[PDB]
Amino acid sequence: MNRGALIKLVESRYVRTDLPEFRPGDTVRVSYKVKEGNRTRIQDFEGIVIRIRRNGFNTTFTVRKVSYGVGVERIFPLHSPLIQKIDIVQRGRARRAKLYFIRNLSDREIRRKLRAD
Amino acid sequence: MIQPQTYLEVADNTGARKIMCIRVLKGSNAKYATVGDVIVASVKEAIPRGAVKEGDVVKAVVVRTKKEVKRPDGSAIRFDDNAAVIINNQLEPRGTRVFGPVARELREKGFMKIVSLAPEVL
Amino acid sequence: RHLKSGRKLNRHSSHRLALYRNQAKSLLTHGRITTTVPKAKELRGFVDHLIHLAKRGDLHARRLVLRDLQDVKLVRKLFDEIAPRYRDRQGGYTRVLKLAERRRGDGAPLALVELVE
Amino acid sequence: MKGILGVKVGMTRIFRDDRAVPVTVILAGPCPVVQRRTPEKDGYTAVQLGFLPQNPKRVNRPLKGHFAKAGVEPVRILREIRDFNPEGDTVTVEIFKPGERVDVTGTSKGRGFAGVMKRWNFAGGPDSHGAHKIHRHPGSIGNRKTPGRVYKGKKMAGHYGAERVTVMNLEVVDVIPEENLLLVKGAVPGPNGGLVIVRETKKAAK
Amino acid sequence: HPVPKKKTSKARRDARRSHHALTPPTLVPCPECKAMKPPHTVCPECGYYAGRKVLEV
RNA sequence: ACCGUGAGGGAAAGGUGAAAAGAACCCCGGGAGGGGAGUGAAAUAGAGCCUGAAACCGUGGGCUUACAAGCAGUCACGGCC
RNA sequence: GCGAAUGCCGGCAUGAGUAACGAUAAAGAGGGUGAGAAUCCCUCUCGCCGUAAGCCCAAGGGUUCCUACGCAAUGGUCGUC
RNA sequence: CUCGAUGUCGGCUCGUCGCAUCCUGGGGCUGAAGAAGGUCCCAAGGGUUGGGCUGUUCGCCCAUUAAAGCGGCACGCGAGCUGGGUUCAGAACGUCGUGAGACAGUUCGGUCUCUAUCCGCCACGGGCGCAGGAGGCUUGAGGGGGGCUCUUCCUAGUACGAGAGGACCGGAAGGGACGCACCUCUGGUUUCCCAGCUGUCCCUCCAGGGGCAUAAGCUGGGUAGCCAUGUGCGGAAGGGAUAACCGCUGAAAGCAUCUAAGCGGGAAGCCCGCCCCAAGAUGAGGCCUCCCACGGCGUCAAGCCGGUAAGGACCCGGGAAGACCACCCGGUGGAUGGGCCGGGGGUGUAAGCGCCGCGAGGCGUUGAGCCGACCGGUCCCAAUCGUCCGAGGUCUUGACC
């Protein structure tokens, strides 16, 4: 019973699936739109593209910093169910080894290297 | 994420996108040039011409790297540390500047100009 | 800091694994062996999992625990010698039990523990 | 205004248009195990239990203390004053309405025995120009002829975990009437999967 | 460096040695033969509960 | 003896008994050592063993002691024995 | 004829059954011999040396080395080593 | 007193009281319009930042700040550090000295020990007791913890107004610092969780592994626990006495006065309200339930024995509780551990054979493989058997039946 049980439950309650979207993939830079908004309920299907970085897993989870070269390096981290989300579509490839936090990217990247993977 | 003494980045009418702040402009007990805050500093880095100089202003907090945790559980981090220089009132320094969007900023609000100003990729 | 603690042991992880094994081995040899209180306790947990693969019974499994004990004689010795004998119960193939006395000089409480027939 | 509970675990949730985090309160439902009538204990109040751990295991006394107004077969019990029992059995399946403010407490997870380091704030001493004590150690303790000795009540090393305590206001967030559970966004006062209680006081004028 | 002052008499010495004191050894009889057995144990005789597997040689 | 390189410094320990008759032998024990038999005038004269006290630690008994602040004590008195 | 002189010589106390065992180069098993074996013997797992924890000549030590019995003293407890 | 011995500076760390109170408020006063100052009496509540240079505390300076106080305790702190210091020999010169040597002129280095006995503080236990023997729930006299402050805005830009400018009263939101808990989330760890790697001796050559490369050789990530830099919360109300200071009713001073008389106003302070201890408060225990008056002896038989599992202790086995200990749940009529199993979350597609390349390896079966503390199943194993201690119920008075 206990924890596992009851809790599993309440969450199931609220989050339900984070909106069946189960497209994780390690690599894949990809793109989405979160409601993220302010100013006159300007909740905007805002879409950021980002090279897939990491994640938290259980009730509460999060599609991690996918780093995005904006013109400086900006990495974007976002909670998974987090009703906050609407569109979440992949573009990139779910490839590469050593598993996540492979910031190798954000760090010494270098477009070339980037592609080097 | 924060700092007192600091080698920070900017990109306004900068002498150089870099100045060292003393501390936080908030509630007398600084300890955090924190995201979206306002604080104190002088230049560290050079400045071709430019009316900027090797002085000291105060201004407002951009980027950080160690958790931009927002109200909506919006989350982010840029491998960059920088804010925009202020002229008194706050009224920003330069005509433009190299950087972009995201809540925290506008949210602090007082600086809409910065707001519309740094938009696109970079 | 410390309190809520799992897998509880002494000496030094290398020393330990060292023992766990050496012992797991010697017991495998004699069915029953004599040492000190937890020597047994934990040794149970361990030689324990080993017999578990002993049972596992297959080219791979074999490959593994061998990975750990290093040496055919026993390798097979267990894997086929008794692994069958057990393959059918629900683990706990260990019988850890408190002898009559305590080694000298100190009074270290000891016992015999073995494959539980 | 009081709930008796088996504190579950802490977890995150969402509200309005934003996530935030809560905690899992669970309580079958204590019952009038003992009443201090006032003429009884002019410190008038209600004592209750809220579960049941094995019956084959149970002192006679317990058996009949229960006998009293007779109720069930548990062991979790305690008391609180100035709280009527407009019932003779309580659950919370409503007992505790959400969108309300609460106060609550519980057992306090059990620390260890760490000095100036733990126990109190300020992490020890310093480290380098001095290492015949490297980084931290005990502050100072009194003096020559001031009191002429060693003081009597400043913080002190050691055991500072096996105790109990509570938290002031917190939010009632949500009510799950079935599995007698409630999410409250709380300082998980003390462990979890263990013991706690809630009470509500706050004539607080903002 | 900090050698006391004297010794509050055997008196004290005791006070201490005293709260100290030496208790005795737990035991019941062999679940099998007789003599003293501490809780879970066997010995140079009976030696069991299900298979002496012990004593005599 | 023993410290110092050498020069050199430089302890301690006297007695069992009257005479050896100073301990066959039996018994717990690896042994020591421990109970007996014999010694004898004694062996609380038993081998470091005459006389063998103070100090300190011990086994039993008497009185005494858990709301107590005093070198000590001690004058008084009351309860124990 | 003596408290008394941080006295002189010899006992006997005290913190203390806490500080400490001389290197963080680890050891675990099985059987053996024994009055008793963590601490001896074989044998089996295992770590640390190896450029030394190698061997070698020499110095200086001067018993001991061996083989056989024994352990009350001695090893910083063990201990049939 | 001290020379049979008392460590002197500066700083550190933990500070503790004090008011001639700095910020706080309460105030009468103004040369007080407002605002803002400034002028005294009351009141320590909390609070009473960073750096710079200087061995200097003082100080001067940078930036803020509500504010960035004076000082008591051998100028608190060496049995708790630090030790630049001035103050053992050096050597330096600058300076005296006929020179030996010297200068509170200076400058470079310059061997600070500490196994706690006492009373004292921090904790945790063993007693023995608060005259039945018991399992458990309480109420607190009395003691402990925290009581700070900024800015935005409504009222409200009207009270003041020439104007520039800003108000009692009272009401919202955000924050700094700090105190209390706590991991979901955020990030930190994770000596074995997983994964990659060189060198090397070993297994059996090949792969597939193995110890050593620290007590993990190295690397990249990594639960769970613990933990900030992450999260909730808190410093309130509000009740009663009052400080300065304001008044009511009123004489003695046949007009007057707050003034002994009698009444009220009033401070972020005092008692409470807030949490945390607590009858070893011998002045409790209050309530609940429950076992009943056993045997034999000189009597106030308040001494000796089995006694009730009434209950508990012991041993075992388990614990975010934990040095030991006590606390806590359990012992097989159980799930308590470990085991196993299902599952989470970890690693990042194994081992082999198979498919393209002389080869390096590449692709397939593979997001496989292997896994420690996290939810929970199932007696696979080990919580067997036992033991011991633990009421009979003082005298006395009053009351009821």
Tab-separated table of C-alpha atoms in Angstrom, chain A residues 36-39 62-65 67-79 82 84 103 106-107, chain B residues 17 65 67-68 70 72-80 82 98-100 103 106-107 112 115 120-122:
chain	number	residue	atom	x	y	z
A	36	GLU	CA	4.118	30.415	-20.849
A	37	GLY	CA	2.408	33.772	-20.670
A	38	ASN	CA	1.850	37.035	-18.832
A	39	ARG	CA	0.583	40.544	-19.777
A	62	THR	CA	10.967	17.368	-16.785
A	63	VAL	CA	12.246	17.552	-20.349
A	64	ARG	CA	15.491	19.146	-19.597
A	65	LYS	CA	17.726	21.826	-20.787
A	67	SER	CA	20.476	23.825	-25.180
A	68	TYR	CA	19.740	26.384	-27.876
A	69	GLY	CA	22.295	28.633	-29.509
A	70	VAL	CA	20.342	31.880	-29.599
A	71	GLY	CA	23.285	34.076	-30.261
A	72	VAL	CA	24.688	33.246	-26.881
A	73	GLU	CA	24.033	29.924	-25.225
A	74	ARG	CA	20.653	29.559	-23.664
A	75	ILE	CA	19.538	26.235	-22.332
A	76	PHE	CA	15.903	25.522	-21.670
A	77	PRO	CA	14.639	23.186	-18.867
A	78	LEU	CA	10.895	22.412	-18.547
A	79	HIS	CA	8.657	20.311	-16.313
A	82	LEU	CA	3.299	20.641	-16.144
A	84	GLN	CA	2.063	24.420	-18.916
A	103	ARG	CA	26.342	19.131	-21.896
A	106	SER	CA	26.510	23.637	-24.317
A	107	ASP	CA	30.096	23.527	-23.198
B	17	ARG	CA	30.099	44.005	-21.846
B	65	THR	CA	23.367	30.087	-14.674
B	67	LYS	CA	18.370	28.182	-11.879
B	68	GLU	CA	16.006	30.650	-13.379
B	70	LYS	CA	9.774	30.887	-12.441
B	72	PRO	CA	4.735	28.980	-13.630
B	73	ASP	CA	7.394	26.399	-13.037
B	74	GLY	CA	8.797	27.673	-16.196
B	75	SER	CA	12.468	26.725	-16.025
B	76	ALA	CA	15.742	27.788	-17.638
B	77	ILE	CA	19.492	28.509	-17.509
B	78	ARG	CA	21.847	30.282	-20.002
B	79	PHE	CA	25.603	29.617	-19.914
B	80	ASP	CA	25.896	33.428	-19.680
B	82	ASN	CA	24.913	39.690	-17.833
B	98	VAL	CA	22.985	41.691	-27.993
B	99	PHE	CA	20.465	39.242	-26.242
B	100	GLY	CA	16.731	38.195	-25.949
B	103	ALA	CA	9.552	36.247	-18.389
B	106	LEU	CA	9.662	41.822	-18.437
B	107	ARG	CA	8.152	40.420	-15.336
B	112	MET	CA	9.836	47.481	-20.996
B	115	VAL	CA	11.794	44.270	-23.158
B	120	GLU	CA	15.578	37.848	-31.682
B	121	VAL	CA	18.025	34.878	-31.748
B	122	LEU	CA	20.891	35.987	-29.503
